[PDB]
Amino acid sequence: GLEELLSAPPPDLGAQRRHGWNPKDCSENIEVKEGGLYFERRPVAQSTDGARGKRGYSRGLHAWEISWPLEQRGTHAVVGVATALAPLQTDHYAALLGSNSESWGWDIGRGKLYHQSKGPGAPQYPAGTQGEQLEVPERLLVVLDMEEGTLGYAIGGTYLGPAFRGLKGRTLYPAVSAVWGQCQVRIRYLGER
C-alpha cells in the first residue's frame, strides 16, 4: 500500500501538527515550532539532541517526510524511530539515535544504519552503496511498516528497501538526533494505511 499512501492527498497542517514533534518529548535544547511542524536546535556546544513525534505506531503502514537542510547537518544527523524510552540528549556529539536498544536510525551524512551501535561496524544503506557516493537530499521519506515490522526510507519517488527488521510488537515514534546549532528539521506526516 505504499504507492497508494504516497499518491493520496497530502495531510493538512492540523494532521501534521498532531503527528509532528512533541514539545513534551524532546531535548531541553530543542524548541518545537508551529505546534509540531518543525523544531530548531539551540546552539549548545558538546550536545546531541533528539525529538520524538507525538504519536507512537504499533500497527499499520506509516510514512512521513523529514526536511533537513544539507548545510545544517554537521557531524551527526540521524533519522529513524525510537521507543518512548530512548534517551533524547547526551553531552557529546554522536549518533545518539541508534546508540541503544531503544532506537533505529540512518546516518544521512554517512549512509550507515545504527541500532545498539556506537558507529563502528554499522552497515551501509542502501545495500551495497558507499556513503561518499551518495548525498541524501534535503527531503527524505521515512516508511515504517508495523505489519511486517520494518523501517525503510524513500527518496525522490522511490523506496530504497527495508533497512531494519524485527520491529513488530513495539510502539515506535518518529525520531531524529541532531548536533548542529540552529538546525531546523521539519516533519510532515503523510498518513497511515
Binding site: Y93, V179, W180
Partner: peptide, 9 residues
C-alpha cells in the same frame, strides 16, 4: 569562544 557544529564558542 567557537565550536564546531555551529555551536557556541
Amino acid at each position: 569562544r567557537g565550536d564546531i557544529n555551529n555551536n557556541v564558542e
